[model samples]
Target: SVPSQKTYQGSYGFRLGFLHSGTAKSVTCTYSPALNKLFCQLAKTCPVQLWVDSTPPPGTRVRAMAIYKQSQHMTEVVRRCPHHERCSDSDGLAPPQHLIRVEGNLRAEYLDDRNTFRHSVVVPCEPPEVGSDCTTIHYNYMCYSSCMGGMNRRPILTIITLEDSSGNLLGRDSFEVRVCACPGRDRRTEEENLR
Candidate 1:
């Protein structure tokens, strides 16, 4: 089943890159926290430095950084956290898992080492400080809705901009989220529906 929501305790993070085909303009970013669950987040850190051999005769050799984070669902639930005291639900999804995908040249690419390209960055990061309980939204790389001539080029900026949201009016968020931030692309369903 396509589970409706996923939440993380304390923290979570990942660094991704949107490979631009041409001379690129600056890329902007934004984020929000999850409801009920503590906000999971990334910081104002810049992209991880990479080793690129642009001088290659034909092909290029690029070592992309890894993207990772703590599993939103733990080995076992504690049965009770501050938010749960006010509710009466059974277990949510077992093993709150998520799929982090990058959509561009080859449709959506999952963050696997093989495809974690040289352009992307490193992970296994720290949760942003109190303020870090926020987000690192994804920018759909320059691509067309459909591939054209073996190349993808278009402004998905609007598509990406539409997702900028937080749980609270102050740009906070909670539960059942979903995003390019993968950890992002999420929020408490009930809360969002209300929004």
Candidate 2:
């Protein structure tokens, strides 16, 4: 088995529903494979809200919706929707039968034998946004040990829930980011392989 690092970026895309019982739906971006799931119902009668306040403290859900990364083996929220001077609520949610856009930056440090890691994600978004004449979360990482045979990492747009200022969810949609990685490798362990 490949020894797990204390902090390592997992697959970028994989939708796991939230654990809420509300009529609204949510899918939080998670690092560990266990936390990816969906919560609440897909179709709802109430006005679903979408919010992003990923600065910690006051907004817990916003922080929960960040792209996690390993910074020197310490898990941290490296990327978020928008935690700045001011942002629009409409940016996070979507209307029925309407198309949605996204914004945000995604960066990864390529592992150099665990000593040095350079920016792996090709073009880092200065201010991750859609239709701003810029890029967001579209890069690559070349892991030396794992790149031998050249593994293909698949991409997935993990849809997240957007909330209002009152903390009520407005709606869930493809608000931001595209993560990628190989799938189903861990399903069978080394011992399972030896058998």
**What's the TM-score of each model vs. the native?**
0.19, 0.19
Q: How many residue pairs clash in each candidate?
A: 21, 24
> Candidate 1, 125: how far from true, in Å?
2.8
- Residue 13 error, candidate 1, Å: 12
Model 2 stretches with alpha carbons more than 4 Å out? 1-64, 67-75, 80-159, 164-180, 187-195
lDDT of 2 at 9: 16
Q: For candidate 2, lDDT tens digit of each residue in 1-195? A: 111112211222112222233221132221222323221111211111222222223331211122222233223212211221122332222211111122232221122123222111111113225654321232111111122122112111233332233434433333222222221222122224545
In angstroms, the error of model 1 at 62 is 18
lDDT of each: 0.22, 0.23
Q: Roughly what TM-score does model 1 have, to 2 decimal places?
A: 0.19
Poorest stretch of ten by lDDT in candidate 2 = 39-48
